[PDB]
């Protein structure tokens with residue numbers, strides 16, 4: 274039931290650590306999950322749908338963790354408030370690098386992967402701009418750029434820079450320095466006049 | 467000679483405006499260039515090599531334009547100096563959107579596209595950090611983050627945000643606002659304490 278399905282998801286996340294989706298077959302997923310090939314098709318329509326579900330779970334997990342933070346103001350300065358919010362994405366996607374990397378490569382070929390990522394990016398950007406606007410209304414941040422365009426560039430910087438660090442791309446910020454690097458650019462660009 | 471080769475490059479840039487590389491055939495390139503299929507193979511080994519050359523030309527054109535700017539200090543404030551430097555990439559890649567978009571999609575499948583992009587990104591990042599370090603030595607910028615990690619995140623923010631605007635992705639900064647948006651984040655993060 275849920276257990277056959279979880280096994281197929283866990284097998285897929287395991288195999289994605291060692292190779293691309295294109296080198297994984299339904300048979301591989303089935304075997305690792307302990308079921309036949311036609312039994313697999315009962316739970317998912319294809320290997321692509323397995324990645325879609327893995328991505329959907331990671332993205333919802335980041336999203337629920339951000340909602341938790343939002344409902345629960347951490348008792349600290351502005352710099353540390355931004356750091357804890359960015360750290361949701363650093364720790365959540367950072368704990369699922371193979372899925373992130375496969376989900377990235379799938380954006381170009383899968384409309385459902387592209388729209389899932391786009392829906393949540395819009396949600397996180399709107400939340401970011403709502404926080405910047407709140408900061409400006411309270412007199413803590415100056416009215417510089419439109420809050421929504423600034424939120425957009427900052428979230429896209431994080432998407433690209435986090436990914437680069439997790440993949441070890443050249444060039445990339447080392448993964449042990451990427452949080453401090455991003456928090457500095459967010460705080461100076463939000464609070465700086 | 468150069469003219470058959472230029473015609474093939476121009477045909478490819480034309481067709482890439484209306485469809486992906488995967489929907490363009492060697493025959494298409496040949497016909498549009500006025501030559502046969504086997505004659506095409508004399509000039510390039512495949513359609514992929516045609517895109518590689520198109521990308522190589524655009525990237526060298528941005529690079530030569532930045533070198534021109536670097537040797538020729540524009541007589542203006544710090545904000546406008548950064549804006550003119552970013553504008554090299556905005557205008558150069560902005561004038562070749564179909565090639566940019568195809569070159570992006572090819573990074574995932576072509577090692578030569580991946581290494582060309584990576585070589586020049588490292589060069590532009592090193593140049594950026596050299597300028598930040600010069601600014602700090604002169605007392606114009608404070609010593610905050612390591613100049614090279616800050617250069618890295620800013621260049622990756624621009625890569626991702628420029629591309630998003632040129633492709634009209636959702637989310638993206640509108641193309642008429644993307645320069646001001648990026649110059650603000652660069653200036654506040656470089657000069658802000």
Ligand SMILES: O=C(NCC1CCCC1)C1CCCC1
Pocket residue numbers: 339358359362363394397398400401428429431432435
């Ligand atoms: O780090 C990121 N966003 C920062 C947050 C601060 C508060 C809410 C958004 C992006 C990385 C990829 C998706 C979102």
Ligand SMILES: O=C(NCC1CCCC1)C1CCCC1
Pocket residue numbers: 532551552555556587590591593594621622624625628
């Ligand atoms: O805009 C960019 N770099 C800004 C420049 C300011 C001075 C030299 C680098 C990136 C976009 C894609 C490649 C580089």
